[PDB]
Each structure stands twice: as structure tokens, then as C-alpha cells.
Design a protein around this nucleic acid. Structure first.
Ligand SMILES: [Mg+2]
Ligand SMILES: [Mg+2]
Ligand SMILES: [Mg+2]
Ligand SMILES: [Mg+2]
Ligand SMILES: [Mg+2]
Lengths: 49, 48, 137, 161, 350, 58, 183, 182, 40, 133
RNA sequence: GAUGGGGUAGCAGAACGUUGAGUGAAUCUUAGAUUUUUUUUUUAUAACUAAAUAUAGAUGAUAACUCAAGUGAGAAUGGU
């Protein structure tokens, strides 16, 4: 997503969208520029190695 | 004696000296990847 | 009242009055490591010195290019380029390929349609049914 | 056809009969006037300077006129004094004393009336508007045919038509 | 970096110079090829050909630049093209005589001649560029070459209030082509119609300079041969530069001036009248002689087109395809000069 | 008229014009023997800063 | 290529030709002596000459793909010449795909309903290439029964004299004598 | 210079051959025109297209800043007596644009998604066939009237550049022969 | 889609829509979509 | 050498005095109608020529102007005209593949053809003055 | 100024490509290795030029020569 957002700001210029005011991404349920409780707290069970 | 790179061609055309000033003003790295670390998001999650 | 038009320019006819070789520059790339560049190295030492001496109107740039096949890239006055990979070609096969770029022009390959190409008008004007003896059905 | 060679034989047109009579016993020059329009570079003898030696009888000689289309006549029926009357009437009432009215009375060309005098500005602007109000009643299909008629005339004088 | 040593050794204070040094030209493979591509005489060193590529936009110094070389060359090109056209077409109107000059020795053709020689431009001028590259700065149009034309006192009112400018005055005040006289850095931008003209102007000054260099080194005859081979060898249809207004009046005024019988339009041939695309062949006759012929779809157009062809034939009269020019006499021991036809002037109509 | 050529077996054949008739083929191990203009020749041509065309010819 | 560089306008223009089905034709007649026995061009022999004009095959710039044909105005189609007993014994057929719907008609019966103009159109039609230009070329055949037609002003002229008129030839030669007074 | 929003609707319980006809109806219309046709449509999916088209317009205004000049544009029409712009769409429909910021449906297409479910069709002779329950999505590209005005000015310019129709055209002879035929 | 409960993110985009259309706030380009060094 | 005819000696000045001239050169027997400035693309690679070589064409079938036409029985006398060309280079066509195949036979034999062509440029076409001859 | 030139069954010779291995603890790669695409050129079942997109320092790719085969698919009412 950051690869496509960096290309629009470079192109649109004064028409850069206000992505922070947009709806959530149902693929994750997260807002703009927000992590997930599982990814922000690193509660992922990792292997023993 | 060595391989001609895209940098050498710009130097011949004279455009390299103009690219250094712009990149320097913007703080972008002139010849190199800068002092930026590698992608760690997947690494911190235990990515193999 | 005659008013001059200011949007028509003269066209050049290469060969009439003066001739200009189309191949402005030739780029020769070799690998000291690649095995396919064995013949190119022999062409740069024996046949290129004398071939480059017979074509003083061409710019030759011999530069290495490791981890890559050997190519002969010729830049032409029209702006286009023609690159020929000469991997696994003996020195005398490189000279036959280098002369192909010299004798060639930047023009893209086209099928043979018409021998003659002319921009000047017909000496005998195009046929007209109103400028002859007339035809009676 | 199947190949380009066959297509060429079917689309063949033989050369002109003059070239078919190839000579024998040697070389010769034949008179072969083509049935085409001559270029503006074949200057007629009437436009050649008296010094130009190339002037010469028709090469044919070395081996009623068509119908009239436009033969105008120039007439001068307006005296120096009548020109003053044309300038007074045109400025007194440009509506009643139009160019067509003065052209008839004075027996002159309508253009000639325009040369001696012009109508007052406010009256000229009224004429340009009348023709502008009729140009807005034209649909997309008529207004396009009128623009072509105005461009074909410009193209004619540029040597394109 | 040590892994990438410089390909071309250069002092540290190199990029600070306006253009590469003279000795730099002796180790460039582009100049040696450009010198041999044009078959230039060995009298012209590589230090001189390298000076013809440095436009005044890159080097403000009166030396090291193209200002003076292009000036001497412009006079040679403009002169040889002028005498050659008056001897070939001695009846050309003044207006068509200016466009024909601008069509041969103008910025447009000279730009194509420079590109026909394989001359590639440099992005930005500097002491590091290859001496064989055309150096100029399209962002600074301040520099203006010196010309023999003078500035008009009414130039201000001319461009604004659309004041009248005659043709007879352009041969003294205007430039050689009839045009009026006098008509840190961020490269994050796009091309401009000002740069397109500044770049086209840089290519023209280079071609002219090559003629000036051949003149100072090889002589006058060598310069004339170069102009006759690359510039005069081009093709131009002068008949396509004509734009007539009321050609029927100009023709009547011509026949009247030359005493010829008043022109009469006669219908030579016609077909398809009362159709969508008829054909009327109208021929204008002055007595019993056919002046011109024109075939159009409308009866009026066929008469106008015939008058143009009758007028073009008068103006495009040519004594020969390769006539002698007055400059051929000064060479040496040339055949006696024969007076050339001098026309009285173009016809002024209503 | 034949432009300069390089015969792979013989050497560099200089330009020859049969209109005035001389196909001389020079072969060697140095640029000078070939008969072409070398870098050294261009340096001596650039050092002759005194040669000047006759004023009558200029 | 120079031969084709120029003004091709007049080479592609449509010329309006004319021919009478009653005027004797010394060329398209099978009888050549005595001159008083020279007949007009028969139905098929006239249609073969017209089909050549409709295709433009008489032009040095002919191309089958380009429609470089011309017009042919045929008059006096009522006195169309035929040999033998073709007029009363020849038959034209028609079928609309329905068994039993075979329509037959003779030439004399077809000349009474649609005149001799339809008999000449079917002849010329069959002599044209069977492609998408057959209907355009055939439509340029203007056949009329008598001497009157709406194209008396379209017929090609040379000095005001229509081709085929009494003095059209001398009017052409007089215009070419003046064209030689130029370089 | 021209704002644009590419909005992909949610997964609708319908097929492509059914919803395609609903996407071709709102194609080229305004957001208001399309919403009125979805409110009074007999199709069941027209209720989902009306909700998904109101969400797209909410995103086009907040994130892209579209249709936010009606008040300013209206001032120039009546107060100043300016006549609006008259254009003609590619299909040929004539329009009168009084507000250049009005949103409309520039492009619209339908894509098929995952499979809702699978119902077994038990036929005679002990034969069973699977019935795939489809799901499709729709994508609408919302633009402003400034795009239709620009695209229109290009077409008319392209037409005026093709030159007028000449009576006697100079058609070429596409065949070279080494002799003169005339 | 018409029966999905509106979340807090959809209840906020409807309030902004009524603010930009009303004229209270003026729309401005985003400034946190991507942290570039050019800043253009 | 055989003397030129008296009829050709009196009309040749009129042939050369006209504006334009064309010739039908014969290279290896095949004709080519060219004009001064045209570009001939021969359907074969002329052996032993490099870009810049000047050729003198001596076999002309017809050398005529608008109205006049000079025709030699086998060919015209070389002393009357002077035509020269310059070798501009060699061009090639795109590769063409021909597939030789028969019905009910899987074998498809391929034939790859890519021919070279020599390009000329007619830079001189003038008629001589034979008043002395 | 060499001679020769269609081809089924069938026989014969010479090559390319694919997968893995040796040289290889080798060579190259943010001065862009690799990117299923597009483009350009070269007598070309193949490689190459350049462009666009993304970003790897080796669990990456790779010339040349050689070695070994689970090595080349519009056809089996073939299988998934
Ligand atoms: Mg059961
Ligand atoms: Mg055989
Ligand atoms: Mg065989
Ligand atoms: Mg890629
Ligand atoms: Mg199968």
C-alpha cells in the first residue's frame, strides 16, 4: 500500500487524497496508519529455534 | 578499462553534477542506499 | 498580391552534393571472463585496429561488460541503435557483423516493395483525360 | 493472388505506345507530348524575356478559340463631382442610400461605391451582427459545411486545391 | 570510489569551467569522427572544431565560444544563397525571396543539417562534458547575435497596435530574413517554447560556425563548396511558398503593364457539370496565347487557379537549372561575365 | 571511386579514384604504417598556429 | 516513383461519356464493308466496351481495388441492335428460392416493361467483377430509350464541342497546338 | 488537474450476467441520476448499488475533495449572467454543465468474486450436479464534469484538424513500374 | 452491503461529508499519505 | 567511334533545355526509371562496394524530357549523357518464415529468409553538349 | 566463375532447449544481480538491446566446456 501511496502523492500533487479520513481496510480491519494489537505487541508465538 | 555505468554517461553529458545538488538538497542518497536499515517488520514477527 | 508562406522548409538528400556515413558510433563490449567472448577478444586485438583505422568517421568505444555476452551496438545519426550479440563467433565473423552495422542505416527493416523512391514530380505529368486527344466510347 | 509476383502480373499496365516503337539502326529522338497538365515551370514564350535565347518555334515545328467564360468590361460612369454626392448621401442616411441603391442610380459596380465611401461605424457593426444572428440559427450539420467552404477557398489560394 | 576510478582524468577544478579546455579536444573520439564525417580539410585542427560547439550561452568569453565564427559564416551562407536564387529565379517577389532564404539558411533547416551530422547535445554545459558535444543553455535567451538590421522606432506600436510594416523597408532595417530586430538553477521543469527556440538557435550557430572556420582556415573557395554541398544541395519547391490574394486582378495588372492583351478566361474542357464533383478546365488567354491553365471543381475556382498558375509561371521563370553566379568571376581567370536578367519588380494590384 | 577499405587479408587500401587513372594497400604493425592520421598527427596539426591562408585566397 | 508524384486529381475524376445504340460503330461492328452496311455495336459488344469504362480499365492508373471508373450515358436503347432471333427467342430467368416460383421472360417482353435499358444493364452487370463494387459501377450506367436525358450538360466537352459531336476532334487538336508554345 | 475515485463495491450475492445490466445503466450518468434509477428499479441488487454508490460519493468528497464548488459555481451562473457550457458525450448526448465539479460515473465494470456456496441439484436416474452460488463486485470510477468538458474539446479539435472535404482528392497510385504508361 | 452495521469509521466519514458540503471546513490535500523527502 | 546521327545532333540541345529529365538505367539488365536525386533500392547485395563509392551508369534505355524522348536501339550512346550514383549502404528485410506442409502430415519444414539490399542515390543526371562531336 | 536442392514408410548425420551435477571456497550485482511482460537487433526451434514496475548481497544469477536423464505434447471417446 505504501508503494502505491508514494506514487500518487508524487503524481497528484495538490490533489493528494486525505487517506486518514477514509474507511478501514476490511482485509485487515485497521484504520489508516494504525497497526494491529497482535503486530504492535508482538504477541506472535515464535518457534523455539 | 572498466564497465561504463549510467553514472559515467551522465558525467559525460554533464547532467551528473546537476543530479548531486538536487539529491543533496532533498537529502536523498547520492551513490548508495543511505543509512537506512533493511525491512524488519516481517523479521520482528518471526519470519523465516 | 502575393503573400509568402512561412511554414515550408527545404529537405536534405544525403548523397547529393555530400555524403555522410550514418553510423556515428560503434560500441564494442567484451568479457574477460565469459567463454563466449573468446572470439571478440581476438577481434579487438587483430581486426579492430585496422578496421577502426579505415573508418575515421565512426566513434569506437571499447569497454568491458563482465557477466554478459559480447555485443556490437551501433548508434546511427537518426537516433536509433542496432545491437548484435556475437557470442561464440570467431574474429572474422565479428568483422562481417561490424561491417553490417557500418553499411546499414538506423532505418527499421522493411519488406522489398518498390526499387525507386522519389520526392520530385513526374517529368511527364500524371495522366489526365482532359489533356489528350479525347476518348470516344 | 498467392504471391506478390503474381499480383504484379495481374495488375500490369503496358507502357505508352510511343515507347513500344523502340528504334533500330541507331538512336533517335521522337516527339512524345504527354496527356497531362504542364507545370508552372514550362514558362510560356509570352513570359520569356526578349534576351532569353531559348525562345524558339514549337518543337512540333522542328520535326478558332474555345468558348469565352469571363471577358469583363470596365466602365467609368461616375465623375469626380458625383463621388462627392456618394459620400454625402452615404453619411446622411446609410439605411436608405445603401450601396445597391447608389450602385443603381450612378450605374457603377457595388464594390466601387464601397471604395469611394464607407458607412459610419455604428452602421457597419449593425451589419456584422445581422450576419452573426443568422450564423447562430445554423445547426451542427450546416455550420460545419460553411466552415469547409471557407477553408477550401483559403486552401485554393495556398496551392493546396 | 576506489572501485570506480574516473574514466577520463581531469583536474579537480574542471566542472567549474564554462567549457572543456582546448587540449581536451585532442583526446575526444567524437570530434575526430565529426571532423572525418564532414571530410574537413586537415588545415582545420580539432581545437577549432571544438570551439564551434561551445555556444555563447555556455561561455560568455568572446573567445572559447561560437559568437564570432557563426557571424562570419552567416554572411557567407546568406550571400551565396542570395545570389544563387536571384540568378535562378530573377523574378521572385520580395516576400517569396525572404521565405526561400529562411528555408535554406534559416534556423529550421540548419537544425536538420546539424542533426544530419550526428551532433548530439550536452544536457548542461561544463568543463567535464565531451568537447564533441554541442554545449548551450536553453534557459538563458539573453545572448543575441549581432546583425546588420536596425531596430524600428515604431516596434513597440507595431506589435501592440498592429501598425503597418512594408516589404521595401525590410531590406534595410529588418534582418536578412525579413524579421524585425529585438522582437541556484532548478532543472525540475519541462520543455518550453522558449527553450525549443533557444535549442534550435544553438544548432544553427554551430553550422554557420563550421563555415566560418573553413573560411579562416581553408579560404573562400572551400567555404563556398561546403555551402554548395550541404545547404544548396537541399530540395525546396518554391511554388509552394505562394499565397495569392485576388490573383485575377494581379494578372490583369501584369498583362496591362507588359502591354499584353487583356486576359480572357476560356473553358477548354468540362465534364460532370450539375454533379457533386465536376471538373472545369479554364485557360486564361491573352489574345491567342495561353498564359496559364487551372482545373478545379467550381467555375470560379477554376478561373482563380488558372490565374495563379499564370502568375507562378511569370515569377518562376528560370534562365537555367545551374546558372552562373557573380561570385564565380572573382575566383580567377574565369570566362567573361554575361549580364544577368534583372526584373523590374512584382506587380502591385488593387 | 572507392572509399578507404580494410581488406582482412591484405590491409588498409587507401582511397582510389579511377576517374583520373592506384589501389595502394598499406599493412603494418603500427598506426603510422597503415597510412592514416594518428593522434600524434593531430597534435602537430594543432601546434602549427602560424600557418595562414593567403589573403588573396581568403 | 517520380511517375506517380504529382496531381492525381484529374486522373481519378469521373468523366461522363456518351454513346448511341443506333449510331454505326466501325470498330465494334462485325461488318466492315461496304461502309453502308456498318452496323451499331451489338448488345454484348457494347456491354463489353461499357464494362471496361465502368471499371476504369481504360486508364493508365487503373487498380481493381480503387473505384476509378467513369460514367457512360447510353441513348437510343429502344433500337438496341441484336442479331438472329435473340429479341424473341432469348429468355431471362428468375427464382426466389421457392420451388415452383421460376419466372421467365423474353427480351421483347422485357423491353416492353422496362425498355431496352434493362436489357443492357443485365449484360453489363454480368461483365463486371462479382464483388462489392459491382453495384456502384453498374449504377454509373445511364441508359435511356430515346435521345433525351438529364445529362446533356454533363457530357465531357473539348472547346464547347461534346465528344462524338460533328466537330469535336478539330476542337481538340486546336487546343493542343497552343500548348506547345512553352518551354 | 482532474480528480478521480476508483471504488470497488463489496461482494454482492448475484452473477455477472445479472449485475452487468445494472452497471451499464448508471454508466455515464450523474451520481444523482444513478441514485434515482436505483431507487425506482425492480432489481433486487439496485438496493445494494444505491448504498454502494452513496459510500463512493462520500469518499470522493472527503478523501478526493470532489463536488465542493456548487456554491461558488452557482454564483457565476446567475449573479454574473454567465451562460453554462454545452458539450456532447462520446455517445452523442448533449449536456448543459452548470457546475464543473458535479460528480458522475466515468467508468464502471463488474468483476466476479468468490463462490457463495454450493447447492446440489438431485436429478433423475441418480444423477447429482453442483450449483455454484455466485458473488460479484462492481467498480465505479467517479470523476467530475471537468473531465467531460476536456474530452469533448479534444474530439471537436480532432475533427477540425482532419481538413475539409475536397471535391477532387489527390489519391495515390500504389504501383511502381519502370516505364511511363502515358 | 446495505445490511452491514455501520462502524465507527463510517459514522465519521458521514459527518465530514456534511462539513465539507456545508462550507465549514475547506478541503486540503493529504499530508501524511507518504513521508517523502521531496515534499512536492 | 560511330558518329552520332544528324537528327539526334540537332534535337539533343532542345532535349537538355527543358526543365526536367528522366532516365531508365539498366543494372544487370533490369531497368530502373530514376531522376536526379532519387533513391534506388536494388533487390540484391552488390558485391565489392562500401558506403560512399561512386558508380558511373553507362547503360540507359531511355533519356527523355516531358515532350522529347531519346531512345537507343540496344541502348543510348554513353557520350550523350552522364549518370552517376553513390552507394549509400545496405538494407535488410524482416525475417520471413515459410512453412512447407502437407495435409495429414505433422512435419512442418521451416525456411528462414532475410535478404540484404544495396541502396543507391542518383546524384548526377545531365545531358552532354555534342555540338563538337 | 565447382556440383547439388519435393517427399510418406524408413535409414542416416549435425545441433538447440529442459532438469540436476562438475570446474565453483570461481565470476558478477543499489554505479541495479533478478524481475513469466513489452520493445530492439542478429539467418534466429535462440539470444540480445532498451524501456516500464519492484528491490536483493546470498537458500541470488551466471558464460564456457564436460557429465547424467523422471529431458521437449493440438491429438490415446487419455488423466487432474
Ligand atoms: Mg435416487
Ligand atoms: Mg526441386
Ligand atoms: Mg530433402
Ligand atoms: Mg523486467
Ligand atoms: Mg488430451
Amino acid at each position: 500500500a505504501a508503494v502505491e501511496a508514494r506514487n500518487e502523492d508524487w503524481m497528484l500533487g495538490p490533489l493528494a487524497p486525505r487517506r486518514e479520513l477514509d474507511e478501514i481496510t476490511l482485509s485487515n480491519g485497521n484504520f489508516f496508519g494504525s497497526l494491529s494489537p497482535t503486530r504492535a505487541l508482538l504477541e506472535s508465538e515464535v518457534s523455539e529455534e | 578499462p572498466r564497465r561504463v555505468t549510467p553514472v559515467d554517461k551522465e558525467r559525460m553529458v554533464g547532467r551528473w553534477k546537476v543530479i548531486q545538488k538536487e539529491l543533496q538538497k532533498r537529502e536523498l542518497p547520492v551513490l548508495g542506499t543511505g543509512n537506512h536499515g533493511k525491512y524488519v517488520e516481517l523479521k520482528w514477527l518471526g519470519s523465516k | 498580391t502575393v503573400k509568402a508562406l512561412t511554414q515550408i522548409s527545404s529537405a536534405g538528400r544525403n548523397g547529393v552534393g555530400a555524403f555522410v556515413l550514418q553510423c556515428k558510433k560503434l560500441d564494442i563490449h567484451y568479457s574477460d571472463w565469459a567463454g563466449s567472448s573468446r572470439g571478440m577478444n581476438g577481434f579487438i586485438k587483430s581486426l579492430l585496429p585496422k578496421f577502426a583505422a579505415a573508418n575515421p568517421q565512426i566513434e569506437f568505444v571499447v569497454s568491458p561488460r563482465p557477466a554478459k555476452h559480447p555485443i556490437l551496438m551501433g548508434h546511427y545519426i537518426n537516433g536509433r541503435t542496432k545491437a548484435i550479440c556475437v557470442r561464440n563467433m570467431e574474429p572474422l565473423e565479428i568483422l562481417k557483423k561490424a561491417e553490417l552495422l557500418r553499411d546499414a542505416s538506423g532505418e527499421k527493416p522493411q519488406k522489398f516493395k518498390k526499387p525507386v523512391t522519389s520526392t520530385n514530380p513526374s517529368v511527364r505529368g500524371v495522366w489526365s483525360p482532359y489533356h489528350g486527344q479525347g476518348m470516344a466510347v | 493472388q498467392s504471391t506478390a509476383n503474381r499480383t504484379k502480373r495481374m495488375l500490369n499496365i503496358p507502357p505508352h505506345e510511343s515507347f513500344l516503337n523502340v528504334p533500330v539502326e541507331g538512336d533517335r529522338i521522337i516527339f512524345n507530348p504527354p496527356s497531362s497538365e504542364a507545370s508552372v515551370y514550362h514558362t510560356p514564350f509570352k513570359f520569356l524575356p526578349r534576351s532569353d535565347p531559348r525562345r524558339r518555334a514549337n518543337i512540333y515545328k522542328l520535326f478558332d478559340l474555345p468558348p469565352v467564360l469571363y471577358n469583363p468590361t470596365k466602365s467609368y460612369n461616375v465623375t469626380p463631382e458625383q463621388v462627392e454626392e456618394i459620400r454625402e448621401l452615404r453619411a446622411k442616411d446609410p439605411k436608405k442610400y445603401s450601396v445597391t441603391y447608389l450602385s443603381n442610380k450612378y450605374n457603377c459596380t457595388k464594390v466601387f461605391i464601397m471604395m469611394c465611401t464607407q458607412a459610419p461605424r455604428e452602421h457597419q457593426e449593425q451589419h456584422k451582427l445581422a450576419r452573426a444572428r443568422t450564423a447562430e440559427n445554423w445547426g451542427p450539420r450546416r455550420a460545419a459545411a460553411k466552415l469547409d467552404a471557407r477553408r477550401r477557398k483559403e486552401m485554393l489560394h495556398r496551392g493546396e486545391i | 570510489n576506489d572501485r570506480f576510478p574516473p574514466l577520463e582524468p581531469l583536474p579537480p577544478a574542471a566542472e567549474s569551467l564554462p567549457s572543456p579546455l582546448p587540449e581536451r579536444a585532442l583526446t575526444s573520439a567524437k570530434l575526430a569522427a565529426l571532423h572525418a564525417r564532414l571530410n574537413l580539410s586537415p588545415k582545420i585542427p580539432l581545437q577549432t572544431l571544438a570551439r564551434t560547439l561551445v555556444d555563447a550561452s555556455a561561455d560568455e568569453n568572446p573567445q572559447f565560444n561560437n559568437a564570432n565564427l557563426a557571424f562570419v559564416g552567416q554572411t557567407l551562407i546568406n550571400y551565396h544563397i542570395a545570389e544563387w536564387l536571384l540568378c535562378k529565379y530573377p523574378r521572385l517577389p520580395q516576400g517569396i525571396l525572404f521565405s526561400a532564404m529562411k528555408a535554406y539558411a534559416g534556423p529550421k533547416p540548419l537544425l536538420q543539417i546539424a542533426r544530419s551530422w550526428g551532433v548530439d547535445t550536452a544536457a548542461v554545459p561544463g568543463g567535464e562534458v565531451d568537447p564533441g558535444l554541442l554545449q548551450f543553455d536553453a534557459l538563458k535567451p539573453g545572448v543575441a547575435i549581432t546583425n546588420f538590421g536596425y531596430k524600428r522606432t515604431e516596434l513597440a506600436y507595431l506589435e501592440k497596435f498592429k501598425w503597418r510594416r512594408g516589404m521595401a523597408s525590410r531590406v534595410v532595417l529588418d534582418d536578412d530574413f525579413g524579421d524585425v530586430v529585438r522582437s541556484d538553477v532548478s532543472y525540475d521543469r519541462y520543455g518550453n517554447p522558449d527553450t525549443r527556440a533557444a535549442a534550435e538557435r544553438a544548432h544553427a550557430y554551430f553550422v554557420r560556425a563550421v563555415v566560418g572556420a573553413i573560411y579562416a582556415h581553408c579560404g573562400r573557395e572551400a567555404a563556398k563548396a561546403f555551402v554548395k554541398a550541404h545547404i544548396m544541395s537541399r530540395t525546396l519547391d518554391i511554388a509552394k511558398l505562394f499565397e495569392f490574394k485576388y490573383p485575377t486582378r494581379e494578372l490583369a495588372a501584369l498583362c496591362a503593364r507588359e502591354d499584353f492583351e487583356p486576359p480572357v478566361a476560356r473553358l477548354l474542357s468540362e465534364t460532370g457539370r450539375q454533379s457533386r464533383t465536376p471538373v472545369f478546365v479554364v485557360g486564361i488567354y491573352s489574345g491567342s496565347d495561353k498564359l496559364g491553365e487551372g482545373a478545379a471543381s467550381s467555375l470560379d475556382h477554376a478561373r482563380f487557379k488558372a490565374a495563379m498558375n499564370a502568375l507562378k509561371a511569370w515569377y518562376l521563370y528560370s534562365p537555367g537549372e545551374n546558372p552562373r553566379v557573380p561570385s564565380d568571376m572573382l575566383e580567377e581567370g574565369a570566362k567573361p561575365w554575361t549580364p544577368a536578367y534583372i526584373d523590374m519588380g512584382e506587380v502591385i494590384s488593387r | 571511386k572507392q572509399v578507404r577499405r580494410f581488406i582482412p587479408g591484405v590491409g588498409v587500401q587507401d582511397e582510389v579514384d579511377f576517374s583520373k587513372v592506384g589501389a595502394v594497400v598499406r599493412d603494418g604493425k603500427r598506426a603510422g604504417d597503415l597510412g592514416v592520421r594518428t593522434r600524434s598527427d593531430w597534435e602537430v596539426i594543432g601546434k602549427m598556429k602560424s600557418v595562414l591562408p593567403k589573403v588573396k585566397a581568403l | 516513383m517520380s511517375q506517380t508524384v504529382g496531381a492525381t486529381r484529374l486522373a481519378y475524376s469521373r468523366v461522363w461519356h456518351h454513346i448511341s445504340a443506333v449510331t454505326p460503330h466501325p470498330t465494334l461492328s462485325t461488318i466492315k464493308a461496304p461502309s453502308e452496311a456498318i452496323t451499331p455495336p451489338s448488345l454484348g459488344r457494347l456491354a463489353s466496351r461499357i464494362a471496361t469504362i465502368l471499371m476504369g480499365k481504360h486508364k493508365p492508373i487503373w487498380d481493381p481495388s480503387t473505384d476509378c471508373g467513369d460514367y457512360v450515358v447510353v441513348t437510343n436503347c429502344a433500337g438496341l441492335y441484336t442479331t438472329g432471333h435473340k429479341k424473341w427467342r432469348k429468355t431471362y430467368y428468375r427464382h426466389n428460392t421457392r420451388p415452383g416460383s421460376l419466372q421467365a421472360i423474353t427480351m421483347d417482353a422485357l423491353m416492353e416493361k422496362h425498355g431496352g435499358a434493362e436489357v443492357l444493364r443485365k449484360a453489363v452487370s454480368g461483365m463486371l467483377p462479382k464483388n462489392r463494387l459491382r453495384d456502384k459501377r453498374l449504377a454509373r450506367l445511364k441508359a435511356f430509350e430515346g435521345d433525351a436525358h438529364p445529362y446533356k450538360e454533363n457530357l465531357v466537352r473539348f472547346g464547347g464541342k461534346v465528344v462524338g459531336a460533328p466537330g469535336w476532334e478539330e476542337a481538340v487538336k486546336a487546343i493542343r497546338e497552343a500548348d506547345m508554345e512553352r518551354l | 488537474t482532474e480528480r478521480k475515485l476508483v471504488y470497488k463495491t463489496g461482494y454482492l450475492p448475484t452473477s455477472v450476467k445479472k449485475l452487468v445490466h445494472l452497471s451499464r445503466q448508471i454508466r455515464g450518468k450523474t451520481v444523482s441520476e444513478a441514485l434515482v434509477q436505483m431507487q425506482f428499479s425492480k432489481k433486487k441488487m439496485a438496493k445494494e448499488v444505491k448504498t454502494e454508490l452513496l459510500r463512493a460519493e462520500a469518499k470522493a468528497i472527503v478523501t478526493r475533495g470532489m463536488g465542493l464548488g456548487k456554491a461558488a459555481a452557482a454564483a457565476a451562473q446567475k449573479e454574473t449572467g454567465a451562460e453554462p457550457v454545452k458539450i456532447q458525450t462520446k455517445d452523442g448526448k448533449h449536456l448543459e454543465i452548470r457546475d464543473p465539479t458535479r460528480i458522475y460515473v466515468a467508468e464502471t465494470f463488474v468483476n466476479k468474486g468468490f463462490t457463495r456456496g454450493v447447492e446440489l441439484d438431485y436429478r433423475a436416474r441418480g444423477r447429482v450436479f453442483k450449483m455454484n452460488k455466485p458473488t460479484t463486485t462492481m467498480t465505479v470510477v467517479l470523476k467530475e464534469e471537468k473531465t467531460r468538458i476536456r474530452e469533448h474539446q479534444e474530439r471537436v479539435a480532432k475533427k477540425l484538424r482532419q481538413g475539409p472535404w475536397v471535391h477532387l482528392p489527390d489519391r495515390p497510385v500504389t504501383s511502381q513500374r519502370q516505364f511511363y504508361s502515358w | 452491503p446495505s445490511q452491514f452495521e455501520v462502524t465507527k469509521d463510517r459514522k465519521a466519514i458521514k459527518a465530514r461529508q456534511s462539513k465539507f458540503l456545508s462550507g465549514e471546513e475547506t478541503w486540503a490535500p493529504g499530508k501524511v499519505n507518504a513521508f517523502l523527502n521531496s515534499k512536492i | 567511334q560511330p558518329p552520332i546521327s544528324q537528327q539526334v545532333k540537332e534535337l539533343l540541345p532542345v532535349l537538355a533545355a527543358q526543365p526536367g529529365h528522366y532516365t531508365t538505367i539498366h543494372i544487370h539488365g533490369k531497368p530502373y526509371l530514376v531522376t536526379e536525386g532519387d533513391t534506388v533500392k536494388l533487390p540484391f547485395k552488390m558485391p565489392g562496394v562500401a558506403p560512399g563509392d561512386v558508380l558511373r551508369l553507362n547503360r540507359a534505355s531511355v533519356i527523355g524530357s516531358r515532350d522529347l524522348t531519346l531512345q537507343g536501339a540496344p541502348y543510348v550512346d554513353e557520350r550523350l549523357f552522364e549518370c552517376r550514383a553513390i552507394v549509400m549502404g545496405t538494407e535488410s528485410e524482416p525475417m520471413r518464415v515459410m512453412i512447407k506442409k502437407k495435409r495429414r502430415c505433422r512435419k512442418k519444414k521451416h525456411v528462414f529468409s532475410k535478404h540484404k539490399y544495396t541502396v543507391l542515390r542518383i546524384n548526377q543526371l545531365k545531358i552532354n553538349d555534342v555540338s563538337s562531336l
